[PDB]
Amino acid sequence: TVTVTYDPSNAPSFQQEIANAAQIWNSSVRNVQLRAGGNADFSYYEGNDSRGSYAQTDGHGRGYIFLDYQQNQQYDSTRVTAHETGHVLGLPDHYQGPCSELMSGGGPGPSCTNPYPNAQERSRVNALWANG
Ligand SMILES: [Ca+2]
Ligand SMILES: [Zn+2]
């Protein structure tokens, strides 16, 4: 198990969703763990961007996530937060997938509230972090 450290301090309005998203991911996968701490690998910011929330990342634990206010009020915020965090873990967007695929993100619409990765998503994250 590899530990990726994040900094949630610049997203004051989303502290509980970030904590919720990190726990979902920690309770779903074996080879990587997310923990809040100093000298962080990636960080969370918040504001307004009509394209919604996004991740600026190398796909292997680093960069930052921007959480948009309107998207997190119209869609379930834990799903939004957990989805964007999936990008930092290495998973790509797959907009045509169903609600049970966390990486389909907003594709299924606002009625989709599931913040959990499916079995294939979890399996792929374990493979991407198996050797660090
Ligand atoms: Ca929720
Ligand atoms: Zn995405």
UniProtKB/Swiss-Prot annotation:
One GO MF term attached to the UniProt entry: zinc ion binding
One Gene Ontology term from the biological process aspect of the record: proteolysis
Annotated residues for binding of Zn(2+): H83, H87, D93
Family matches, as Gene3D superfamilies: Collagenase (Catalytic Domain) (3.40.390.10)
Catalytic activity: Hydrolyzes proteins with a preference for Tyr or Phe in the P1' position. Has no action on amino-acid p-nitroanilides
UniProt KW keywords: Calcium, Disulfide bond, Hydrolase, Metal-binding, Metalloprotease, Protease, Secreted, Zinc
Active site: E84
Family the UniProt entry places it in: Belongs to the peptidase M7 family.
Name the UniProt record assigns to this protein: Extracellular small neutral protease
Species whose genome carries this gene: Streptomyces caespitosus
Gene name as annotated: snpA
